[PDB]
Write a protein that binds this ligand. Structure first.
Ligand SMILES: N#C[C@@H](Cc1ccc(O)cc1)c1ccc(O)cc1
Ligand SMILES: N#C[C@@H](Cc1ccc(O)cc1)c1ccc(O)cc1
Lengths: 10, 224, 218, 11
């Protein structure tokens, strides 16, 4: 979850 | 796009050094584990930003980007550690104020073996006189080699490989010596990877033993 | 030795073809690994220089690298047989047969995919010879002899590629592509070792003494 | 076991 956040919404 | 431009992109994309302070008291198992895991968690945030600056990476499938980072993260951390350490023989330069000795490994059961492997592999890179622009390419190769998106990934790995070949060629040594140097560098990828495997095993065991703090990103990446 | 003469020595060192002669698949595989380990020791001793290493170093290299060496051999035997793992003439397995034991499909998929990468690179026999030796010698006075031997085998690989006549650029690219594929062979061997250690800890697969010795090092 | 050493030291 956190990895996908940093990859896509940062 | 040109090998020079790719190298200059990687140079610019280099993460800032993460600052962590040495504990006030001599290291305990808890304080050593806290220091190294806090550092790893902060460096993982920066690693994700770095990967997104590698030309092409963001055009892979999200699932491919995830798999590569999940596969390679401890290897990438360890390659960075070895590079930070190459100018300071005998030391592992985890951070500017986190400069550890083979012997400070004694604070955590089983971690001295990991420190010895990292110090030895660092010494191999030191003897090969690894250069900054070679390191940049090799660190990117670690990520991209860890695993339409599949074709794009092959293309990106070839581009970085071509960049390393170009870097070595700028050194002006003979064709045969350029090939030997490329082979000597890449044969260390399994030694860094070995250290990663042993580090990951150790950290998983520590998570079992209840010594690993609640650092969200690290735990996600450890669990896979 | 010239690189050509070193490669011929590795050609001469090659082990014989080995035949095995659910539970049955796992027994066949562990029986095969035990037989192949006997021939692997013979092979290593025919690598020029190896027997002049310390006994300690000879033992640690074989203990470290054996599953990687078995898997590199399997990939070579399988290269011209898409979809199949040619363990032996009488042990040809596919991923369907792998599904029959928990944890084996993953391994077979990894082996098949890495084989497929070697097939796409059109790996040559003499390239295989050099990389299998390199796997053994690069595994985790004697120290200097080992570094000399690994350098010699590396030089031979560079020479094999040089003999293909492809461009100088393309030679460097090919060298890198082959060497990068070996961390994939090593991953597969880590997964296989893990699986076999679990099988041994459960007493699910038979007691073959050399295999057990070589597993116990891990 | 010492089969590895046995095989390393005999033919
Ligand atoms: N060595 C080491 C670290 C991992 C690490 C490596 C490089 C970095 O830049 C930051 C952290 C470690 C931590 C906990 C363990 O249980 C085992 C190993
Ligand atoms: N794959 C596979 C084999 C090992 C193997 C690899 C190559 C050979 O030439 C012979 C045997 C295996 C055996 C038991 C396990 O529990 C898991 C994997």
């Amino acid at each position: 979850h956190k990895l996908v956040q940093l990859l896509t919404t940062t | 796009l040109s090998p020079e431009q790719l190298v200059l992109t990687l140079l610019e994309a280099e993460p800032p050094h993460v600052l962590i302070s040495r504990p006030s008291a001599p290291f305990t198992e808890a304080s050593m584990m806290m220091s190294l895991t806090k550092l790893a968690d902060k460096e993982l945030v920066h690693m994700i930003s770095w990967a997104k600056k590698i030309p092409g990476f963001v055009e892979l499938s999200l699932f491919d980007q995830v798999r590569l980072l999940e596969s390679s993260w401890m290897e990438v951390l360890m390659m960075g550690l070895m590079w930070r350490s190459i100018d300071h023989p005998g030391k592992l330069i985890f951070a500017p104020d986190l400069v550890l000795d083979r012997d400070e490994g004694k604070s955590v059961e089983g971690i001295l073996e990991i420190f010895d492997m990292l110090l030895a592999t660092t010494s191999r890179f030191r003897e090969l006189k690894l250069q900054h622009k070679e390191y940049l390419c090799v660190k990117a190769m670690i990520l991209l080699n860890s695993s339409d998106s599949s074709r794009k990934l092959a293309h990106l790995l070839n581009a970085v490989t071509d960049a390393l070949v170009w870097v070595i060629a700028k050194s002006g040594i003979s064709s045969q010596q350029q090939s030997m140097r490329l082979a000597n560098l890449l044969m260390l990828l399994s030694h860094v990877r070995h250290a990663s495997n042993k580090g990951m095993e150790h950290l998983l065991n520590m998570k079992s033993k209840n010594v690993v703090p609640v650092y969200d990103l690290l735990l996600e990446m450890l669990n896979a």
